[PDB]
Amino acid sequence: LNLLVIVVDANPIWWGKQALKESQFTLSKCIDAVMVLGNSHLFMNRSNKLAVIASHIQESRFLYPGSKDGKYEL
């Protein structure tokens, strides 16, 4: 039983300057690496738990709290 609590600094101004930079790496791959880390953590053991929080500029809203994709439904 383990509990990873990812916190992703979703500054819309910073990732906005990153997406106007026209780089390779934008917010989509950031949140996708977050979700692949989350599914990996739930994947390593059955008892693991996950919670993903996104600090916005004015709010701490949580992100986290059939199988068409083929992944586990949960």
């Binding site: 599914n39 994947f43 053991n45 059939g66 199988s67 083929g70």
Partner: protein, 449 residues
């Protein structure tokens, strides 16, 4: 009973077969979670990778103190056909995950091209939905009917494919042509075993003869490991199974591990026996299945708080019974009772662990099981027949010279026909099975002079 732990049967599986078993993501997750934590993290490290990493990096990912506990994970990955070895174009032996195994783990973690096993078209609260304690009751009823069949009650509701299975696995020997099914000594040792150990011994000796009914080991073991990783509450469907899977699933219904509703139905309920199917030990003081019930006092006195004709027959096997009350049975472990269990064949670690398993909760903090006088005594009884042990043989005498007799001792020892030697009197006992080979050697030695 050796515990395979998803390793002993899996080890030595056919090369064509090994690739095939990982052709569903259920099997890749199920072999993944069995792994030790080192091999676990290494597969999850090397998963997203197309290059055979050299051996130096794998040996160089580990701190120095843990090399003794490291080579087990590497060897377990290698023998289980995950890490197949490749070559970097110099001499560096590259290591790469089996792309069937790796691709189906990545299907288990990410999107996939297949569509899994669980299914439901849309059937809600089912017609005669079954209740969870009634699933417990069904498990108890069916598996105790099989156990009573082995014991030999008038409750013999086995449907004679299961009786043929019990005769084929070496448990109930049929002898004297006219339907008189006995119990082998393997059946008595099967009775005194734990319930997950009994069911897993059923599955091992069931798949030992899986070359009979058109069965394959791979799909059946994937279905067993699919059963024991399921939930009692949520309900399943059958659509997505072959017809030999239907025959195995209705034979499994006869086992009692799966509650169907109808034979032509589209639904099965994996029973509480099916979840605790695991190669292991149910405990040394208490069982998740049933709480213990036997109070073993220092008077050699068994107090069984359970009404059941099965367990009364088992306590009749390794003891002798005096009182029977509608809540309790009072039995005494006599020497002669264990020596009758010995006559069938019973080593008295079965007895002490039996009493420790069913230890009444007034024995909490009342340990008094540390010294067993009977176990030392039992070796002395066993010694009564060990005091005379059967065999056959020939003796060579008139041995003569001392250094010549030492060379003859190595001839019977290598072949395995030597029993006892004597260098002071020049005497050697040779079994009659290899008498035609020792004499020739002696003749050759004589010729050599």
């Amino acid at each position: 009973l050796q515990c395979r732990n998803l390793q002993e049967f899996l080890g030595g599986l056919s090369p064509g077969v090994l690739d095939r078993l990982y052709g569903h993501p259920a099997t890749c997750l199920a072999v993944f979670r069995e792994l030790p934590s080192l091999a676990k993290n290494w597969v999850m490290r090397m998963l997203f990778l197309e290059q055979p990493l050299p051996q130096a990096a794998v040996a160089l990912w580990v701190k120095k103190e843990f090399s003794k506990a490291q080579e087990e994970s590497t060897g377990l990955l290698s023998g289980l056909r995950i890490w197949h070895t490749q070559l970097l174009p110099g001499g560096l032996q590259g290591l790469i995950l089996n792309p069937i195994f790796r691709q189906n783990l990545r299907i288990a973690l990410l999107g996939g091209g297949k569509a899994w096993s669980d299914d439901t078209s849309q059937l809600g609260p089912d017609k005669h939905a079954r209740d969870v304690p009634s699933l417990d009751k069904y498990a108890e009823e069916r598996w105790e009917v099989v156990l009573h069949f082995m014991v030999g009650s008038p409750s013999a509701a086995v449907s004679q494919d299961l009786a043929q299975l019990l005769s084929q696995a070496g448990l109930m020997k049929s002898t004297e042509p006219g339907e008189p099914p006995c119990i082998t000594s393997a059946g008595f040792q099967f009775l005194l075993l734990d319930t997950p150990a009994q069911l897993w011994y059923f599955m091992l000796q069931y798949l030992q003869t899986a070359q009979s009914r058109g069965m394959d080991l791979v799909e059946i073991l994937s279905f067993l490991f699919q059963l024991s990783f399921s939930t009692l509450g949520k309900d399943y469907s059958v659509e997505g199974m072959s017809d030999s899977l239907l025959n195995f699933l209705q034979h499994l219904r006869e086992f009692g591990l799966v509650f169907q509703r109808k034979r032509k139905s589209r639904r099965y309920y994996p029973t509480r026996l099916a979840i605790n199917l695991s190669s292991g030990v149910s405990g040394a003081g208490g069982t998740v299945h049933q709480p213990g019930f036997i109070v073993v006092e220092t008077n050699y006195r068994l107090y069984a708080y359970t009404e059941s004709e099965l367990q009364i027959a088992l306590i009749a096997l390794f003891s002798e019974m005096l009182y029977r009350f509608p809540n309790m049975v009072v039995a005494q472990v006599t020497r002669e009772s264990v020596q009758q269990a010995i006559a069938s064949g019973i080593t008295a670690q079965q007895i002490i662990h039996f009493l420790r398993t069913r230890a009444h909760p007034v024995m909490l903090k009342q340990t008094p099981v540390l010294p067993p006088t009977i176990t030392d005594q039992i070796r002395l009884w066993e010694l009564e027949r060990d005091r005379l042990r059967f065999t056959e043989g020939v003796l060579y005498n008139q041995f003569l010279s001392q250094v010549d007799f030492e060379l003859l001792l190595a001839h019977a020892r290598e072949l395995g026909v030597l029993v006892f030697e004597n260098s002071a009197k020049r005497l050697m006992v040779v079994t009659p099975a290899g008498h035609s080979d020792v004499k020739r050697f002696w003749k050759r030695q004589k010729h050599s002079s």
